[PDB]
């Protein structure tokens, strides 16, 4: 419309569809981060990186 009403601008309408990676990026990002962090610990201790997968899963 020809009008610039700030309240109209803020107000949502549901038209926007959030991207596919949006509801999963933070879970998946942290999940990979946790595993990768566990990979250092073994590497830091000169253990086989995939040894003790219990800590990776945790």
């Amino acid at each position: 419309s020809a009008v610039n009403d700030p309240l109209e601008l803020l107000t949502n309408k549901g038209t926007h569809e959030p991207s596919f990676l949006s509801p999963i990026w933070n879970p998946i990002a942290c999940g990979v981060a946790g595993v990768g962090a566990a990979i250092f610990i073994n590497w830091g201790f000169r253990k086989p990186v995939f040894s003790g997968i219990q800590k990776h899963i945790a």
Binding site: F45, R46, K47, S51, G52, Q54, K55
Partner: protein
């Protein structure tokens, strides 16, 4: 102190020894488990030293058996060149560059003038240092006293004797002193030290009795070299340690009997020195409160890695001890790809270890 005859039987621990090989003892462990409750009359440290080839090992084993003392075999380079799985690192030396070639007592007796001698002497000090700390953990956690053959305190004699013969340089001696100064102050001096004064001519005869291949063939054990050790033990080491530890001197208990020696030790009294607080004799082991006991126990049980990290003293102006960068890369390749050196001990699958997927545990006071 109280032999089996005095007690009439085996040592009776006051309380169950703490499993110091498997469980750590940090501050929060110290709240529930106290240290002083386990200390007996036999909770002491004994260093059975002497000249070269004086039968110290045989005397120690017998002695440590009578006093119900733990016996710690003298350190040797096999502790560095043999990994846990048993593989011999020295087999890898054809690959390594000459400077990084393995060096042992055999080599020292055969090419004493090689620049790796300075390396070899520092290793012995480092090995004794780690072993000495291990004895303290056993003492403080179990209450059973320990019998050592040569403490790190007495190790500088060999370095000093080697220096007088000219095997070492000025720089190597300068480096050694800084390591010793940087590290020695953190130990607890032994309660008792026993010396076996074999005269110089006797030890020269005695060495040929062992009929060890390299020793007899060698030139190092000269009158001058063996004489230097005698002057160093008595004038520098023994004169210094006696200010803290009780000192017994025998011509050779290795050739003599030990039952007489144990009966000599038990005569020595260890309480007369306790009266004065600041008395130098056995000052180190005088803890007023239970907190002080636990602090010392924590330091050696839980902070040994700190103790073994003080050996990092950077000194590169000395050319003998420096290892060239090109060699280091090559040496790193060969050394750490050998069977059993890929990973920490207890994880190398190719050496037969199993269950690594479900394995997460590592040893305490263990490497890496």
């Amino acid at each position: 102190i109280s032999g089996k005859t005095m007690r009439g039987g085996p040592r009776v621990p006051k309380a169950a020894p703490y499993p110091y090989k498997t469980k750590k003892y940090s501050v929060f462990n110290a709240i529930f488990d106290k240290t002083s409750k386990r200390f007996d009359e036999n909770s002491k440290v004994i260093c059975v030293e002497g000249p070269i080839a004086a039968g110290k090992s045989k005397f120690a084993k017998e002695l440590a058996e009578e006093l119900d003392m733990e016996y710690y075999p003298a350190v040797d380079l096999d502790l560095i060149y043999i990994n846990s799985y048993g593989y011999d690192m020295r087999k890898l030396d054809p690959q390594l560059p000459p400077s990084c070639r393995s060096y042992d007592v055999r080599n020292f007796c055969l090419d004493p003038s090689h620049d790796l001698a300075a390396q070899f002497q520092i290793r012995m000090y480092m090995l004794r240092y780690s072993q000495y700390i291990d004895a303290l953990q056993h003492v403080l956690s179990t209450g059973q006293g320990v019998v050592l053959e040569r403490s790190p305190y007495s190790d500088f004699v060999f370095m000093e004797a080697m220096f007088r013969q000219g095997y070492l340089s000025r720089g190597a001696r300068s480096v050694y002193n800084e390591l010793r100064q940087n590290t020695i102050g953190e130990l607890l001096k032994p309660h008792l030290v026993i010396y076996l004064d074999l005269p110089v001519d006797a030890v020269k005869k005695q060495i040929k009795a062992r009929n060890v291949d390299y020793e007899v063939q060698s030139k190092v054990f000269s009158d001058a070299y063996l004489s230097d050790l005698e002057q160093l033990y008595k004038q520098q080491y023994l004169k210094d340690i006696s200010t803290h530890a009780e000192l017994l001197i025998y011509d050779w208990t290795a050739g003599g009997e030990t039952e007489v020696v144990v009966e000599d030790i038990e005569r020595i009294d260890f309480n007369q020195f306790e009266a004065d607080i600041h008395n130098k004799k056995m000052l180190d082991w005088r803890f007023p409160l239970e907190a002080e006991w636990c602090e010392a126990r924590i330091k050696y049980c839980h902070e040994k890695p700190d103790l073994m990290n003080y050996f990092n003293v950077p000194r590169f102006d000395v050319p003998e001890l420096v290892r060239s960068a090109d060699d280091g890369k090559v040496w790193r390749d060969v050394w750490f790809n050998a069977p059993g050196m890929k990973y920490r001990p207890g994880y190398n699958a190719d050496m037969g270890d199993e269950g690594l997927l479900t394995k997460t545990k590592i040893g305490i006071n263990q490497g890496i």
